[PDB]
Amino acid sequence: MRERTRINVDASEAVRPFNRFWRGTGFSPAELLLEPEMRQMLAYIGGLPNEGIKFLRVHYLYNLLSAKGGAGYDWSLLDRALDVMIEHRLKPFFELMGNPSGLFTDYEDMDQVRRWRDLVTATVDRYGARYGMDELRTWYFETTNQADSGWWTYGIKGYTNYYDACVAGLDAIDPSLPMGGPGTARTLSPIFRALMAHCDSGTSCLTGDGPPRIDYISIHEKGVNGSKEDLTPKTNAIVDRTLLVVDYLKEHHPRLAGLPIVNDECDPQLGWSDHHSWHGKAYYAGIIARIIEQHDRRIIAPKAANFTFLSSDHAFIGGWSQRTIFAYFGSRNFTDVDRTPPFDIIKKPGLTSMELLATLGDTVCKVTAEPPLDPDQDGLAILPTRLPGGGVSISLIHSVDAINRSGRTAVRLEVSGLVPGRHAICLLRIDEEFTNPMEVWEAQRDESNPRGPFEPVGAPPAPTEAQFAELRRAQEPALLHPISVVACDEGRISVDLDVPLPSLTQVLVVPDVGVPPAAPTGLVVERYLGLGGREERMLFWAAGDISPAIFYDVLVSTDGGTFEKVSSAPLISTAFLHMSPPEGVRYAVCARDAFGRRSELCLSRS
């Protein structure tokens, strides 16, 4: 419902601060953290620009513990699970949840309540020692998930004592460790209302002296109900129900109403493992961004509430059509790598969309559009930000709730108010033609000829090595056009964009700092086996600094010969899966800025 829009973004005019408030994902159960598939996934998840994903919300961490007869527990599985997060620069959004060796049966029994308190205290004590208390203090702790679905039994009172025990457990070591909840699934459920009453008036069953503290309020609100049918996400209703909850707090518990509000599981549709094919396509990138933009425009900007964090729950392991950030190819079903079944994973739009969004800056700029933008009616939305050091990062979102709608509009994008001097314009796109590995896969001929030679089919369930190389080129956030460098003496740039429905476009306009970018650091190389037992190496590294619009190449030397490039697309994330390394392989990673300059140093190892 629009043909051409002229959009002017004025980088010289700051409107308000901008936070990237969506930098989280999650999955269940905690045991996946011990599997090699998840280990590989965490390299991609921890490699987004500027901590583009920072928190993992993993269910049933305490099922990793078991009672060692006595006071304590065998911590060794939990240690491995937390260590993999920390090692990939991820932090737990730590749900105090699970039941070590089934020991907990009754939260009204005050000896159990006290034992739970002691478990929480022991957790904080151990991990504060293992990683440092500075690390611990960057975490968030949460109540056990739902509790308004299959909360074993325990009741409202059990729940409220459980909360008390969590809070007293953290307070024994450090009261500044943030605690919140209830992480309820249904809007204004009994559990939710009860915890709010308890934390407002109400008194802790372990102290006896006022309500237990609450540092944030968390709920799950999702776009549409679980179904085998492709029901249509209602994205604006997520914000409507969140504001309803806030209204409930303003009326009934005004002392809590200004607290940080968290949607700890914000997905377009309930039921991750149902098959909804749009999870593999640009629709999902569009819709994640659309949900984000609605929260920014309707909650944060007018200050209707202190909305602080939105976590997706899309790091489950599964196929193209499930709510997963990778498509898993291999023999395992989740609904030493020489022991376990080999596998390949391909990035999907749930992750690439977050790669693009991770590039956003820290300040909202003024934007004017003609005709004026009306995202709730026609689907064209914008997140226009200024980067530290100058320049802009703009997300242009063309997304509607309906899955089955296509089309395109024209945008003339103008950016003014830049500091004069050269700038580079980088255009990244997720749509049907770009960053589109599922489309590529569907068009690949299945060489196993499962319907015989006269009926070729696509979508090979076991792609060839060459097919996988084609998918891995397509899986990376793609340049819509080659980067252009503009000598903008007037501090203006402009560009024409063809904007499909659905699509996500990231426009980066970055100044020339005058020197090559900083070299990458901390290169880790690990062995995996791909489908058919093919040798593979996963590379993970860190950016040399916080510069915008940095792209990485991966090179290979054998066994001393000069380095040749082995990455296909320029990488914006600090992770790369390499297939079939030669003998005596040495890896090197180079950073490239948008002006074509290579980091003077490459980072080596193997």
Ligand SMILES: Cc1cc(=O)oc2cc(O[C@@H]3O[C@@H](C(=O)O)[C@@H](O)[C@H](O)[C@H]3O)ccc12
């Ligand atoms: C769960 C939760 C509660 C809360 O009050 O704040 C959070 C902040 C979270 O991310 C931080 O959000 C911004 C901030 O609080 O300053 C960002 O600027 C931080 O970098 C980020 O860690 C994640 C989870 C929560």
Ligand SMILES: Cc1cc(=O)oc2cc(O[C@@H]3O[C@@H](C(=O)O)[C@@H](O)[C@H](O)[C@H]3O)ccc12
């Ligand atoms: C059973 C159930 C009832 C309900 O009213 O709401 C729910 C919300 C739920 O939230 C999340 O849903 C899952 C999903 O959407 O597939 C997962 O994303 C999360 O693990 C779960 O916490 C899970 C179960 C229920």
